Structure to design on (120 residues):
């Protein structure tokens, strides 16, 4: 993640499983880069089983 | 901070007490103002006796 953002690309598709979702959703907070310029996508069909809070993101 | 970041300004002094320092630090970490586009300062004299670990610190 640090070299891909060093490479200045913003638009990514996360081919990931349900288990890896729980850890990516916390590392995405951990590295500290959460700007609105990024676009994210999850391949799994589950989004209401994981924590979603409106105000942690600033409009990503 | 929403208007302050909308004001094209990134340099804020945070003068606060120990407890208020704790709440504001956990709060700003909670949304994620954690990129290199910020520079935060504490005038509180204890920042080594309060819960600080550098491994969270990777962007700010």
């Amino acid at each position: 993640l640090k070299e891909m953002k060093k490479s200045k690309e913003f638009y990514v598709i996360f081919d990931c499983s349900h288990e890896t979702a729980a850890e990516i959703l916390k590392q995405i907070l951990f590295m500290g880069m959460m700007t609105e310029y990024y676009h994210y996508f999850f391949t799994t069909l589950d989004l209401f089983a994981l924590d979603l809070e409106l105000y942690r993101y600033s409009g990503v």
